[PDB]
Amino acid sequence: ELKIGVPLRVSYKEFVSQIRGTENMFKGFCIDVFTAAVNLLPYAVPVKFIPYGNGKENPSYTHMVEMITTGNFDGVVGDVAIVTNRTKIVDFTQPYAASGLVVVAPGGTPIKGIESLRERDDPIGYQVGSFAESYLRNELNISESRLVPLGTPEAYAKALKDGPSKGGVAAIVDERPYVELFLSSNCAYRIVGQEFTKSGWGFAFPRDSPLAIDLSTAILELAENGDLQRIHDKWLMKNACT
Ligand code: NA
Known part of the structure; x- marks a missing residue:
């Protein structure tokens, strides 16, 4: 069972939020993309989601992925930007969202x-x-x-x-x-x-993790089959100002 860190967001919960009254259950755009991607793998990936944050303010996303390097987390699932001080310590999938x-x-x-x-x-x-x-x-x-x-x-x-x-x-x-x-x-x-x-x-995993590779192929399949756009439309359709 992988211990997957998930940011405990207080705002913009469309991306990811803890289900009220629960410690380990999450929903949102990022969760639906991760679930959809894992479901395209030819092997089981049992996961337990672990909240990261004090519950009062959005957490440090860099500190969250640093918890992979210390072994607290087997991976991190969230709205995590693929930036250089993070790619040097953990392996990301290719982007599931621009x-x-x-x-x-x-x-x-x-x-x-x-x-x-x-x-x-x-x-x-x-x-x-x-x-x-x-x-x-x-x-x-x-x-x-x-x-x-x-x-x-x-x-x-x-x-x-x-x-x-x-x-x-x-x-x-x-x-x-x-x-x-x-x-x-x-x-x-x-x-x-x-x-x-x-x-x-x-999605972030330890350096050399084959999950970071295999889930990028799953992302291709979600992009081609229209599921990436459908999950976007589910959570993130907004009223344009113009
Ligand atoms: Na990447």
Whole structure:
């Protein structure tokens, strides 16, 4: 039986959430894709889902996958971005979902995209627990003093509404899937500029794990048979603002 870590999310639970009143039962987009993929393997993969997080805020996704390296988890199933400090310690599947960072802002301010954000010195929101914090600090050399962690779409909206002068932010940098859910309930805001990274989401296993290989073939079959799109439509259909 594999001990599979699953992020205990407090927000954007469409992706993955613990079933209320349970410790080990989960649902969501990421769970349905993992189940559908495992069901295409020619061998059984018995799993027990183990929540990772304190239940009060979204967990550190990098710390979650580090639990594979110490042997606490046999793998991690969730909305986990396939980024370099993680691929060097664990093996991911190929992406089952596309992702990448975008800039969210009000229209009609100096923030037109990531370059105008880096040229300026305004506070920038990011999602609690996300790789985006390290990406902004290390890849783009944004001062840690500008970076404001936000835990929920209500927190995103309050920070954007308040803006830099009232303890909020000029813009939020986060992965497109979260941002599309956010904007569908918060149309006063928009993506400005282009998606400027492109790491997808994968399932994570120990280095050299054949599961990371075999499940990428299963992903091909879900993509071809229309099940990846059907599971997307089940959980993530949203009301466009435009
Ligand atoms: Na990959």
